[PDB]
Design a protein around this ligand. Structure first.
Ligand code: OX4
Ligand code: OX4
Lengths: 114, 114, 114
């Protein structure tokens, strides 16, 4: 799985251990080994949500399977919770795009997961 | 809707009010309330288009519905026009990927839009 | 085609000519005219792969067609090879998401490719 967070929150406001927490929590939530989890946080972005520049986040979670109605609701609760607690971003100013990737469309280690 | 623009144009060349203009124009074009529109501009990027480092932009527009042949052509005219007028980027050096998202695959406020 | 690479490798470690090499190699691999190839490299990123902050890369390749099982394996060999040789990133710390875009969903020059 791959989780990316783009936010206007300042780099200094991202707490130590944030990437490790995301990795652990996502491994738990998706049921995939943490060794396969990639996380990426991009602070200090020029963005607006609803026409406002208050703290917000635009994210994406890509996974080969483990994507669906109920699972995505669970992921959203978990991730919005983390963003709210760690980055002080209101859940209603967070968008998370979920992508169910086909194994043949994910490259890794000179080949794909097909 | 979520609109992201990545460009090699310098931050200083992005006019004040650009995010607000994108928000307003997108609300009008998509027919959705501005409160749901998210915009993200990323300047000073290391990119090339056609092998050239002249001004260019790689963008994406994600929306739950309101994506299709005719609509996308209209979105492209609007957005390329704005990029040309505000950032001085030639329309033929702009790529905009459109994504019609399923409500179940968009997280927001601790849940999804499903 | 559009290729984007996000990495924690420092800007200074990206060799001169890297964007041109990616452009030429992608033109060759996809069979697409070089003038239609867009490349974007984003260094100095805050990311982790498998919980580790050792050099890694999260990438994406979007193309209208020319995406499939065998082709993606070939693209992965090519791109991981380039990332390993030029940025010193181990192939097993690279993820590349492949997207087969519909011509109607790609905007360019005030319209789409439909
Ligand atoms: O590592 C990933 O997650 N997928 C794991 C996975 C679980 C079961 C399975 O059968 C697979 F083929 C792959 C990918 C990383 C790149 C973005 C898509 C998910
Ligand atoms: O807020 C968004 O736009 N979609 C709005 C929307 C309009 C009509 C509709 O029936 C929907 F289910 C959703 C999403 C934000 C995340 C990226 C995809 C668009």
């Amino acid at each position: 799985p791959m989780f990316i967070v783009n936010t206007n929150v300042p780099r200094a406001s991202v707490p130590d251990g944030f990437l490790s927490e995301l990795t652990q929590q996502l491994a738990q939530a998706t049921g995939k080994p943490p060794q396969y989890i990639a996380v990426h946080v991009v602070p200090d972005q020029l963005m607006a949500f609803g026409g406002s520049s208050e703290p917000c986040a635009l994210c994406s979670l890509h996974s080969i399977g483990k994507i669906g109605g109920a699972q995505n609701r669970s992921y959203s609760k978990l991730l919005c919770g983390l963003l709210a607690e760690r980055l002080r971003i209101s859940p209603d100013r967070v968008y998370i795009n979920y992508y169910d990737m086909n194994a043949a469309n994910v490259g890794w280690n000179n080949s794909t997961f097909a």
